[PDB]
Amino acid sequence: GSRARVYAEVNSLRSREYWDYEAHVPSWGNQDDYQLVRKLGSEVFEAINITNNERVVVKILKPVKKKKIKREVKILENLRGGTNIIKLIDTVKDPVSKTPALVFEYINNTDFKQLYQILTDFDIRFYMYELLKALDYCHSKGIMHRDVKPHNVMIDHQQKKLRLIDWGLAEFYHPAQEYNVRVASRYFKGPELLVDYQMYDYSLDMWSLGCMLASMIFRREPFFHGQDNYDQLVRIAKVLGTEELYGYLKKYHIDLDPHFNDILGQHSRKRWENFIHSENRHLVSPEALDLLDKLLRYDHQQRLTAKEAMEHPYFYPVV
Numbered sequence: 170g171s172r173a174r175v176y177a178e179v180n181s182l183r184s185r186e187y188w189d190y191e192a193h194v195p196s197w198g199n200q201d202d203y204q205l206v207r208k209l210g211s212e213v214f215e216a217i218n219i220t221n222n223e224r225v226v227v228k229i230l231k232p233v234k235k236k237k238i239k240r241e242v243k244i245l246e247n248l249r250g251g252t253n254i255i256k257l258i259d260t261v262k263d264p265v266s267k268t269p270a271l272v273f274e275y276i277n278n279t280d281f282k283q284l285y286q287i288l289t290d291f292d293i294r295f296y297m298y299e300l301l302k303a304l305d306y307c308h309s310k311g312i313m314h315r316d317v318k319p320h321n322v323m324i325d326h327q328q329k330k331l332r333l334i335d336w337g338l339a340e341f342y343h344p345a346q347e348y349n350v351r352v353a354s355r356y357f358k359g360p361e362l363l364v365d366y367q368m369y370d371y372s373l374d375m376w377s378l379g380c381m382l383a384s385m386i387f388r389r390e391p392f393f394h395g396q397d398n399y400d401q402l403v404r405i406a407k408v409l410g411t412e413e414l415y416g417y418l419k420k421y422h423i424d425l426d427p428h429f430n431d432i433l434g435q436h437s438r439k440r441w442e443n444f445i446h447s448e449n450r451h452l453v454s455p456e457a458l459d460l461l462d463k464l465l466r467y468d469h470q471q472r473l474t475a476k477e478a479m480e481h482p483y484f485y486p487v488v
């Protein structure tokens with residue numbers, strides 16, 4: 170099949186305890202230590218630690234999902250202290266219902282729908298670079314996020330702080346492992362997911378990041394706007410090209426779902442310059458498009474790693 174180009178073996182250098190999350194036994198404190206005051210900005214609340222009066226964020230989990238709770242807790246613990254990764258403060262249970270919850274550092278977020286409209290060229294370079302630091306970090310620890318999207322990138326624009334959140338879909342990368350392709354959120358799903366290729370890796374997060382970069386510099390949010398998972402691939406092919414899609418599938422011996430036969434159509438590859446017009450011209454540059462082209466490409470294995478992306482000339486002003 171395929172393997173990752175950069176942190177392929179990191180989990181083989183770990184003790185089984187590190188990645189065997191089904192065996193992890195969280196220590197559950199008492200949620201009564203927390204006063205849940207308001208909804209944050211889903212089942213996430215602003216809270217006050219009653220002991221020290223510190224503001225935190227409490228995320229209530231779904232009690233019946235044992236595997237995923239252990240997986241999210243283990244991954245968050247493995248990543249603790251990672252650059253721009255949301256800090257898990259505590260793991261607690263409500264003493265009556267026994268429902269598990271996670272306690273996180275508080276970040277005063279600006280909704281991306283408003284924030285992205287005032288970002289400058291420099292701002293986009295700055296925050297993308299910060300997000301790349303988080304991805305390079307978690308990839309280096311053998312973990313794929315699998316849900317990179319604007320809602321999961323909290324930004325405090327006052328303090329210039331960025332935190333990558335919601336590790337509920339994150340998984341450990343093991344070479345040749347076959348994963349669930351029904352992950353991420355529709356607009357940010359990589360083509361490997363949409364064609365049911367299960368042997369994917371960290372490069373999935375780099376596709377999602379590319380989708381974010383495209384929506385920020387082009388002001389088309391989301392950039393690939395599929396109406397369903399099938400149409401999502403069609404939207405991508407209208408840009409990257411249909412013959413190019415087939416080349417990708419041939420290289421990895423992927424059979425295309427026959428449903429695509431009559432909806433895919435025929436589309437030549439578009440040059441990224443095609444998406445420039447007066448409303449986004451001040452966010453676009455040749456270096457932006459060169460980076461983008463090396464992220465949003467079918468071949469997951471040839472996509473830039475997070476570290477390679479960080480070395481790109483697009484980030485020279487923020488390095």
Ligand SMILES: O=C(O)c1cccnc1
Nearest residue numbers: 213226255273334335336
């Ligand atoms: O990890 C999460 O889901 C999270 C963390 C802080 C704030 N909102 C969500």
